[PDB]
Design a protein around this ligand. Structure first.
Ligand SMILES: O[C@@H]1[C@@H](O)[C@@H](O[C@@H]2CO[C@@H](O)[C@H](O)[C@H]2O)OC[C@H]1O
Length: 324
């Protein structure tokens, strides 16, 4: 009774983010086995990002990404593309020179059309624009925004949809799970985009949280308002970081409670189509390096053994299945 088996019975996808070159890891066999056994949706953690897939202005490298897609297809998993427009991990040919509006727009269009067309029909969901909103509730002053203005967002979606009209295009961001200044800006942004015919098919909530969880009432209401905009909802990069000092047992218990609650709420909203963790084993996680003093934020420990949260999630899924 794996997570993906339960997911399939609830008509949703449960997955993870695949680490760079997972096929050549010292423990590739084990990593791949746990992955194929538990999940039915895969997001390449980095190998579909600009610096890897488009290393030079006129050169593309789809090699690593194709291996992610190949693993997914062979193991009956759908692919979640990530990400077409972001301010980080951009190549030197982009950040190392000055651009004018028209020039950067042509670059953006070429990148998007080339990548989306290359995987047409093979990537079901694309994170078209990632983190375009500041933590102040305004447009993030990225190279894209400063050079082009806010229209780069609308255009990215329009161009992606032209390249693959069947792909579900979403806006992805962090700290917008609850109703707050940031999510309010995102809500109004997407509302206006769809009002003018922009193909924003869904919204992605990264869900990079900690053992303290979230204000669940706010999360519930926020999910409902976005769903009412006619959006499909995706929990995209979930992890629940815990401190690496006090009582691990206590923190893992809280972690399990948080996961169970998040799943409970998500499953209660028909608009949520998938839930993915930003990885699945604490052996391979970005958290320890980004959040000082924290870690052990995933489903399995360093030895691929299920943690309390894994069972808590499975329990919730089983409960929902029986309720309906
Ligand atoms: O180097 C990668 C990191 O950038 C990180 O990936 C980022 C984390 O923040 C999210 O909002 C982004 O969408 C995601 O791409 O973790 C994986 C590292 O390999």
């Amino acid at each position: 009774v794996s997570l993906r088996e339960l997911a399939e019975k609830l008509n949703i996808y449960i997955g993870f983010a695949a680490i760079n070159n997972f096929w050549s890891l010292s423990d590739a066999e084990k990593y791949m086995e746990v992955a194929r056994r538990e999940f039915n949706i895969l997001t390449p953690e980095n190998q579909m990002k600009w610096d890897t897939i488009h290393p030079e202005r006129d050169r593309y490298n789809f090699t690593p990404a194709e291996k992610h897609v190949e693993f997914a297809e062979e193991n009956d998993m759908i692919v979640h593309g990530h990400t077409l427009v972001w301010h980080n991990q951009l190549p030197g040919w982009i950040t190392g020179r000055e651009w004018t509006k028209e020039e950067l727009l042509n670059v953006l269009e070429d990148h998007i059309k080339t990548v989306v067309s290359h995987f047409k029909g093979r990537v079901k969901i694309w994170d078209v624009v990632n983190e375009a909103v500041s933590d102040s509730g305004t447009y993030r002053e990225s190279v894209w925004y400063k050079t082009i203005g806010p229209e780069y967002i609308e255009k990215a979606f329009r161009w992606a949809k032209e390249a693959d009209p069947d792909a579900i295009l979403i806006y992805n961001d962090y700290s917008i799970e609850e109703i707050n200044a940031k999510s309010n800006f995102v809500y109004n942004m997407i509302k206006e985009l769809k009002e003018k015919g922009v193909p924003v098919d869904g919204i992605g909530f990264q869900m990079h949280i900690d053992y303290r969880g979230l204000n669940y009432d706010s999360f519930r209401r926020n999910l409902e308002r976005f769903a009412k905009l006619g959006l499909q909802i995706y929990i995209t990069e979930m992890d629940v970081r815990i401190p690496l000092s006090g009582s691990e047992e206590y923190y893992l218990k809280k972690q399990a409670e948080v996961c169970a609650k998040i799943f409970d709420i998500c499953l209660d909203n028909p608009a949520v189509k998938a839930i993915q963790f930003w990885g699945f084993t604490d052996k391979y996680s970005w958290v320890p390096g980004f959040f000082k003093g924290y870690g052990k934020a995933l489903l399995f420990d360093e030895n691929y053994n299920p943690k309390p949260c894994y069972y808590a999630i499975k329990e919730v899924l089983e409960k929902k299945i029986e309720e309906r």
